[PDB]
Design a protein around this nucleic acid. Structure first.
Lengths: 59, 59
RNA sequence: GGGAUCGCAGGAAGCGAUCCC
RNA sequence: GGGAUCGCAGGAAGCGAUCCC
């Protein structure tokens, strides 16, 4: 694991094609944004489980 | 931007080599963890801006 | 043990400080 | 207008609901 600490309205980076943002919080919930090409997949765990179901390399 | 909402302790996914986790908050600041191979780089914008400065490779 | 709130930084679910129960 | 607290959900700095002043 690699950890970082920021404030609402700031960003973080991954690779050379992705960026991440903390749009804010809503109590103990957290609003998070992602900025990547359609060249990559980005989803919450609940959608991600359909991608690992047999198609992590779509048509 | 692609956006998702979570709570402290939940997680998010990217590609087939990265995962993200909201470890919790510390006021209006937030603390996040990342889970990727050394085959890719991850940093906050303040470090990332030295990498894109004209090198994209350490010493 | 948990919350609020601020700061310093890596491959570590990091590290420090303030406030409240 | 602000705070607390939660649900749904997508390529959008998205959407909804509960509680308090």
């Amino acid at each position: 694991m690699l950890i970082l600490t920021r404030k609402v309205g700031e960003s973080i980076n991954i690779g050379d094609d992705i960026t991440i943002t903390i749009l804010g919080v809503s109590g103990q919930q957290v609003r998070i944004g992602i900025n990547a090409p359609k060249d990559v997949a980005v989803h919450r765990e609940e959608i991600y489980q359909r991608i690992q179901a047999g198609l992590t390399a779509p048509d």
